[PDB]
């Protein structure tokens, strides 16, 4: 099914990054997403279209898996699928991870 949104809340299941959260900037067609501030690596960047534009070792978002992150519900960090079991003529999301029944 799915667990993706373009604003999704996570509690982060990635080690060294647990207990953190962030919007999902963009969803990638690689099973990956970009969560705020936790995929930052220092990147030896060489200017391209080279101008004033800074080189240095710049903080640059990588991307981690969606299965190596876990959702945040609304009071709990539990993840065990989000229900798409209800059809209003189209599948609608709700929590069944902690059963708080909201998208």
């Amino acid at each position: 099914a799915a667990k993706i949104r373009r604003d999704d809340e996570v509690i982060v299941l990635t080690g060294k990054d647990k207990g953190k959260r962030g919007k999902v900037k963009n969803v990638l067609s690689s099973g990956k997403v970009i969560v705020e501030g936790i995929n930052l690596v220092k990147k030896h960047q060489k200017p391209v279209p080279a101008l004033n534009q800074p080189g240095g070792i710049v903080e640059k978002e990588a991307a981690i898996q969606v299965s190596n992150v876990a959702i945040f519900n609304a009071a709990t960090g539990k993840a065990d699928r989000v229900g798409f079991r209800f059809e209003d003529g189209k599948k609608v999301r709700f929590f069944k991870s902690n059963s708080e029944t909201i998208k």
Partner: protein, 100 residues
């Protein structure tokens, strides 16, 4: 140095070392000889500064240089093909001996 060069052109065009039009013509009034008005001015330039709290600019002008690596060969010359040869060599024998 670039700025000075602009200054020089402005001065030159004065064709009188700046304003130095002798008094007379029709209006009276003693004559002067002036300073050297003008400006200077800048021009591509430099600037930028992602500052502004609510704004953002870019650049303009420059160049580049890449020499990267071209590597392949020789490696990319022994796998992308094959120089097989059967080596055709004939060794005509020599008989005629009488072993009877």
């Amino acid at each position: 140095a670039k700025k000075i060069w602009l200054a020089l052109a402005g001065l030159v065009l004065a064709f009188s070392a700046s304003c130095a039009q002798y008094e007379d013509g029709s209006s009276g009034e003693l004559e002067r000889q002036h300073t050297f008005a003008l400006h200077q001015r800048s021009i591509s330039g430099d600037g930028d500064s992602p500052h502004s709290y609510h704004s953002l600019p870019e650049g303009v002008k420059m160049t580049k240089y890449l020499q990267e690596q071209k590597l392949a060969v020789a490696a990319v010359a022994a796998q992308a093909d094959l120089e097989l040869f059967s080596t055709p060599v004939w060794i005509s024998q020599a008989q005629g001996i009488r072993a009877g």
